[PDB]
Design an enzyme around this catalytic site. Sequence first.
Site, PDB file in Angstrom:
ATOM      1  N   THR H   1       7.886  -1.906  -1.109  1.00 29.49           N
ATOM      2  CA  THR H   1       9.114  -2.071  -0.270  1.00 29.49           C
ATOM      3  C   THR H   1       9.814  -0.741  -0.101  1.00 29.49           C
ATOM      4  O   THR H   1       9.848   0.058  -1.040  1.00 29.49           O
ATOM      5  CB  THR H   1      10.146  -3.034  -0.887  1.00 29.49           C
ATOM      6  OG1 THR H   1       9.558  -4.322  -1.028  1.00 29.49           O
ATOM      7  CG2 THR H   1      11.393  -3.191  -0.050  1.00 29.49           C
ATOM      8  N   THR H   2      10.387  -0.525   1.072  1.00 30.98           N
ATOM      9  CA  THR H   2      11.364   0.535   1.223  1.00 30.98           C
ATOM     10  C   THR H   2      12.537  -0.025   1.999  1.00 30.98           C
ATOM     11  O   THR H   2      12.339  -0.812   2.887  1.00 30.98           O
ATOM     12  CB  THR H   2      10.763   1.749   1.899  1.00 30.98           C
ATOM     13  OG1 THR H   2       9.629   2.136   1.140  1.00 30.98           O
ATOM     14  CG2 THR H   2      11.697   2.938   1.943  1.00 30.98           C
ATOM     15  N   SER H 130      10.056   0.660  -4.152  1.00 31.19           N
ATOM     16  CA  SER H 130       8.907   1.472  -4.436  1.00 31.19           C
ATOM     17  C   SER H 130       8.807   2.717  -3.559  1.00 31.19           C
ATOM     18  O   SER H 130       8.544   3.754  -4.107  1.00 31.19           O
ATOM     19  CB  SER H 130       7.713   0.582  -4.279  1.00 31.19           C
ATOM     20  OG  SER H 130       7.766  -0.093  -2.978  1.00 31.19           O
ATOM     21  N   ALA H 169       2.674   0.151  -1.264  1.00 32.38           N
ATOM     22  CA  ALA H 169       3.305  -1.134  -1.028  1.00 32.38           C
ATOM     23  C   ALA H 169       4.395  -1.133   0.046  1.00 32.38           C
ATOM     24  O   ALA H 169       5.222  -2.048   0.085  1.00 32.38           O
ATOM     25  CB  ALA H 169       3.914  -1.570  -2.330  1.00 32.38           C
TER      26      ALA H 169
END
Lengths: 229, 267, 209, 227, 228, 206, 234, 200, 220
Positions: H1-2, H130, H169
Amino acid sequence: EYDRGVNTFSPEGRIFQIEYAIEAIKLGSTSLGIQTPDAVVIAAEKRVPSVLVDPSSMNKILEIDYHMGTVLSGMVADARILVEHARVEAQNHRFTYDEPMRVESCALATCDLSVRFGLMSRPFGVSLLIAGVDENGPQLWQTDPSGTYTRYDAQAIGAGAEAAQTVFNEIYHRNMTVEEAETLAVRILKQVMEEELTKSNIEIAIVPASTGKLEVYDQTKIQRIIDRL
Amino acid sequence: SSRYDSRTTTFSPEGRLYQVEYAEEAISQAGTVIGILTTGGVVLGAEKGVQNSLFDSENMEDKNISGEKMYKIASHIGCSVAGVTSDAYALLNYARLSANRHHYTYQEPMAAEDLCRLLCDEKQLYTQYGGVRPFGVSFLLAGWDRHHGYQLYHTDTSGNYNAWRAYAIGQNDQVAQSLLKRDWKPELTLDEGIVLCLRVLGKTMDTVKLSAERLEVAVLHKVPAPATQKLLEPYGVLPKTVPEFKILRETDLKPLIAEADRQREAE
Amino acid sequence: WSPYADNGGTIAAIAGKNYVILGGDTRLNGDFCIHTRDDRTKLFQLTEHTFLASTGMQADRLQLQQMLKYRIQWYQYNNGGKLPSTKAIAKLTSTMLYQRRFFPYYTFNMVVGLDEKGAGVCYSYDPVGSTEPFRYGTSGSASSFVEPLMDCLLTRQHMVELSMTETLEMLKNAFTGAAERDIFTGDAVCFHIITADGIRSELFELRND
Amino acid sequence: TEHDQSTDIFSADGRVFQVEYACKAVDNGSTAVAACCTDGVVVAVEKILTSRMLEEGSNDRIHAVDRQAGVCICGMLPDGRAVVSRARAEAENSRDVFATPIPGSVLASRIGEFMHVYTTHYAYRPFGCSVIIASYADDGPQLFVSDPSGTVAGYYGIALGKGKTVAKTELEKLNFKSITCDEAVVKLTKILHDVHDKSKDKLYELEVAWVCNKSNCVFQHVPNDMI
Amino acid sequence: SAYGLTTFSPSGRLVQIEYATTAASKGTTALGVKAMDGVVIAAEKKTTSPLAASLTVQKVFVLDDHVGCTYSGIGPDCRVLVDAARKACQKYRLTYHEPMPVSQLVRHISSLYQEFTQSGGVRPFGCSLLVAGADSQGNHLYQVDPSGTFWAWKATSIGKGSTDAKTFLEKRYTNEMEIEDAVHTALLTLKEGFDGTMTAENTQVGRVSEGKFELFTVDQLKDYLDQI
Amino acid sequence: MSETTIAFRCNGFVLVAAAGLNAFYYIKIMDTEDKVTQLDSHKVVACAGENGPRVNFVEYIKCNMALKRMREHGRVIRTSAAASFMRNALAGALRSRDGAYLVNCLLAGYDVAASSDDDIATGPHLYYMDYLGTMQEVPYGCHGYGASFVIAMLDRLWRPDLTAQEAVDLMQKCCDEVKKRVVISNDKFICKAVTENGVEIVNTVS
Amino acid sequence: SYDRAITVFSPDGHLFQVEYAQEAVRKGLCAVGVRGKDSIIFAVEKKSVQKLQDSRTIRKIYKLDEHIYLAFAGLSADARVLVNHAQLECQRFRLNYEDAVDVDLLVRYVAKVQQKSTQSSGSRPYGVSTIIGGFNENGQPHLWKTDPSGMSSAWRAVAIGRNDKTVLEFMEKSYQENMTRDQCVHFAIKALLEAVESGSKNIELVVLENKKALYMGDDELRKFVVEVEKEREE
Amino acid sequence: TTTLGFHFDGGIILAVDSRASSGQYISSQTVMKVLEINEYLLGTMAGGAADCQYWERVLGMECRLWELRNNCRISVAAASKILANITYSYRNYGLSMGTMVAGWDQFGPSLYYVDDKGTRVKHELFSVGSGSIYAYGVLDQGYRKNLTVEEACELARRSIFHATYRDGASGGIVTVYHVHQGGWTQISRDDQTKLYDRYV
Amino acid sequence: NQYDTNTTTWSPTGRLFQVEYANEAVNNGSAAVGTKNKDFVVLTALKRYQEKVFKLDDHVGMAIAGLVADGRMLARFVRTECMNYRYMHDSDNPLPLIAEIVGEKYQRHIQFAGKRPFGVGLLIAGYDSTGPHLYHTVPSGDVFDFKATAMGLRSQAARTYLEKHFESFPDCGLDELIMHALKALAAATAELNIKNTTIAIVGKGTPFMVLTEEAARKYL
């Protein structure tokens, strides 16, 4: 008063606490709702106890949710409790199933809580007209201290009730317009009020089938209705 | 059984709580109790019942914790009661325990008004909730705290309280307020304050000579602070003076029953 | 002794403009064995437009199916006899799975149905209830190969509308391949085609080994 | 005369009037007779019908409490019914906890205790039924009555309700050392047909049950072809 | 039923507490006497018939090794307080490993009486106690009444013949009585108000001395009765 | 111990300082979090530890003190009572279900006479506390990994009669030593002073 | 535990416990609130001047938070309980939401505490009315009154307690929008002396401004009573 | 995820990606990681998907009741507090959350971070997940207070893009929202592979 | 009358007065009628829009008379019993067991001081493995099993009509049975039509159902 209990039945099968609570609603302000096909309209007498009261603060029309509103009659402080349970139920529904509560379900939910007494010492001395739009079009329901709830094409509650139900059995037909109900509303308020009628002295709300939103009328827009008379 | 309920907590047709009112009558029947505020401390004086030869002492190891009418609550607060004796003991336990909880939590003495509020809240609770009679007690609290100095309070059966410079509860309390009203003044020593208390009891008991065996007096005052244990507590700090509650014995009331009988003959 | 068993197998669904097609295999697996080749618990009808489809532990899917079946009966009683739409049941189901956050259903579920405009939709869930509405979905033992194949044939992202029939053939092909390679998936597939008219069903054989 | 409003109160004579009044319900209800025989127990009750349009089996006064035991409620029927559920819990208790069919004397004891307790608390009222208990467990044929007071007594034969003073006179002419379950079904039915008042209650049927060696000691309604 | 039975009447009286007090005053006479080295309490125990067994009627009670009591009024109410008192003494031992001082025990009895004058659904205890004991502060005699009020006494009496018993003790009581002459005075005071002949079987006596409370056996008490 | 705090008391004040850093594992989220929380007009507390325990804890102190001041006509509570209150709550939480607040605190107050009746010794007091409920009055004290370096400098340089200007210099040097020798970066300090006239920020100390 | 039903309906929609609670308010000492431009003035009658009463008298106007005061009429002990609940509520709110409670919110909390006491088995209603005034964080004053039934409502000025109706009538004529701080005090004192005997030391008075509050002294309050005793002879 | 957010002169930007990755297998590329709580407040979601969606839906139910009861909109301070207090109370129960809350109330733009332990921090620039450790790299070079809205949307887009390019991810579609005085506005959605060709 | 306030007071002639009064609440609600042949039960009810007919599970529903808030409680209760049963067994709650437990719930509310009677009568109609079933429950806790009956206002007249015809009902088909149920409900009275009269049916093949205004047009 304490000679007979909160549960006692009368010899004709009424519960005393509930009869007396209904009498209480009669000594209330007057309030009413009218169902057209396009929309559903609600209104009340305010009845301030002086000209030092800020009139905003004495609302008898409350939003339950974007598509439904209530007008109460009888003991205002008791109504605050019902209108809070109803706001919470309407939002639990949307939480759980991501859509608006039906108006009937809301009236059903508010009536369950009415009859929880033996726990609370007494009934609520309150009746509610709930008004809104769901999929079945504009609706108007009425709950009372017995916990009966019931759908109405047009009703009134309060001190001016019995007189407003002879302006209904005359002028009320099923097939009227927005305009004729917004005017029939104010006709009945003028009749059974004690005061002279003014834009500050009454409240009006609509839920039109066009958009499905409750709107609360300004004093600018209530001038336009006394004018049309 | 609900038909035999007395309905102790139910308003009556005028906004009146009869049981609160009747319990106040009970206090008016009780022994006289007087409080006086002076510059050097508070004085509490109380009439006692009539002294049977056959009474005895409890013979307690410490004499300044309780007489017949005076009680320590904590070292900066004492009191006298009028009304149902056993009711007073239940509330005095309540107050001792609350004062000591506050020391437990803040390690500082509870303020006398704060103590008084907790006491009166307990009383009010039996007026609203619970189907039982109220406490039939009135208290006079003598207090010292750093916020407000010497303080004298009165607490009534309603759970109300108010501050005073002199006051009287029990039997002849109108006759007593009449006298204090006349003779109180804001410049009293603690020895004069004691005298004035004795005169006022002498004129409500209805005797020419003050029987020292029919009187109880207690004083809430300050005394020089004891030892400073700077070795066991290097960040201890004591003030010069600290409050004490003292239940004066006969040997201290001898030069003071004498000065109240020279003010009784010269009048 | 664990409270958890994975009984295996596979489900898959595909939507189009006025229908959804839903498939689940009929094997029920034990530990190094097969209880039966004819379990039909993976798919469960909730209204005439809405199905639940589940894999994982079978005893859990049977509990969840019953809890849903009674929340849905309660909705009707409290709502004037009406049934909740597919969108509402999907939101209901997420809500309920989350609520066992702390001892969860061992289930990979799908709610599959028509939307309010008449079009198909599929909600895939994780075990604690995060989902979205999608045009296709799959879960269970063979799902990590059925899913790139559907990505490929339906979205065609690395290249230069289907009937009910073409879509039913794609799924039939996808289960046939799953049974060849996934040892826990096999025997038959039960297919339900959902349209506004109603529900057509069709069994379909697969490898028995 | 405030002394008769709660059952938590003696009167000045040592009476408990709430319990007397509840006994009056029973005495104005329908007439039941029972007989403890060599081979079992038989009960018969008269159901006054409130309507010709009742299905048969409506407002049954006789209920099974265990494989081997049953009760006939005389007096108010729904009160009687609450007594039946307790009696079944007791009977179940004895099999669950002690591995034994409940003895008849013990089941009657426990029913009495239960009826007694609603005679002592301001918040409840006495039951308005008597309960005939018919059993045939390891202690042999037993017939007990419990009443609203909670008194329990064993009997060879008995009669409750409005007909009860005549029925008692006819039950006295039987012979309780000889009589079987087959003979009793006949004789008790004759007594209910004779004490029946025809002016006042036009519609009635008879209910009759038994626990005997014939029925393999199972409490059960007698087959309808024997009246 | 959780409502109070004891309430204020218009003039500030609590009448249920006065009727209870009335019942404690109609009980058989009991009295107590505090000497310079002990305490003695004593009570009439007459039976209604000679069919009753005299020896089992108790009027004086041990509460712990160092303290005892007697009562007048309603016997059965007295057992509740005796049971509570006996427990509080053992409780104090477990906590402080020493005998509960008599002053503390009497404030515990008091607050139990006081509970039953405010609590919902209860009547007051219809008995008053004499309590007699010895602790590190010496020898004590206390009286506790249905109100929950207690007083320390040098000598007193409760029950029907108590105004006369107390009159008679005013005269004969001195601050320098020995324990044996306090027993004598105790017995002599009982004798005056007593209907019929007073025996070792219709009187019971306890005695604190050497820090220990003890009932007299019938035989010990016959000794002291042939001397008077 | 990723957040150093520092405090010392001199004749007529307390200086308190705390490092601005807020971190997520190795990442610096920000370096300007004020951790020197004012509790009342003459009190501050510097807390060390995670955002969540730290905020919840000092908000609970603030509200209970605020409630004690209206139930008492706005009378200021003594520093030693605020510390005793803080200590009882750290200690209580430590034996509770939800467990301890993992915060380490320095409480600094200047006590000022309520009324004329009031005999109180008027001046500055510092209290060290730990997340267990240890509490001790001290002339200076610290928490976090920078604590040992600073404690020794102050043993070496602190006197009671430092002027306000000398004590800012000393506070500045203690912050520099933390930057120089602690590997965790405590790059920016906020420093407040507690005096007879109240709490005030010290701008020249960074 | 006591669970009796105390507040019940009787044969015409009357709740007598609530009525008699409102009787108790009518016997209580008079209180007044008056909303100016940017100041609220609470003024109450004290029992009666005595030599013995303590010069530093107990206050009958309570602070609920830095920006909200309360005065009442009725049973003073019931009111002290009510003020406690309200002080708790304001601090609870800071803890749950960081911001400071709005007056209008705090009024509904209090009013609902009163309403519940009219329906909760075991308990009688409070015998208190309140006047609650305070500011938003945008600086605009509000004045509310609450009664024993639990009904609340906002006012430009208001009287409660004994001679409520008389004071209220005087105030209906004489009230004026956008009064100053000094005008508001003047008008409040005036309003009170329609019920009360003298104006020496039987009046306490709070001036609640945005960012300040004052329990007026006896020097400044004597000044105003003589400015007003001079105007009542005209 | 960002996910990232930051505050500038014209308001706030939020940007996210749309991938959901067990850790190896990619379950979705179409998650909506910005949660329209209502029409003046946004959340973002990082960490556990079920947790973030249930608790922001709950948050949204409280923001609505507040506004029925009080006739006015709740502040961003209080919204973040309701959510920080829920996370704080669940601190010991294993939630996984890293949220931003953003709004424009009467005191202007406010951005908060709030996490599974009860942290709640207000600040002008945040990135969570992440890929945060790559987003900050690009975001710290380009960020300033006086960006235009177009320049600021480009900065955020380029930042999420650079994270998707390097973090296993993060991936999928990049979505940018703008919080302005009038509420908020979804500005763009662009697949990160199509962005690759724009920026090469 | 000293003896008619509480449920826990017998009267000297062995009557429970408060219980008879709760029973009047039923005699003063709007009439409802039930009837049954070999394989169906029909409820009709004269609405005085007021919910008067509720479905309790797939195979059973009821008409009420009297206090509706009581009806709704008794419905939450039976619905929750049938669901439980079907969860445990995968089959229908048998109807005799529904009647027993309703009877017992009523009885408990007539014997304690902390419980009020229920002022509502029910006609329970269902269908299970032993055929169709029509139960009447009244506030005294009595539970009758009928081949036909009526309750509520003027409902004696309905009762009289039924008394002449019920013997023929075993043989009737579902259409004549519905008509008999209407001539009965008519006898308790404005005339019947699709906006003020309800019809519900249950039986073999036939999950419990209120006829819509369309299907009811045929009969009305």
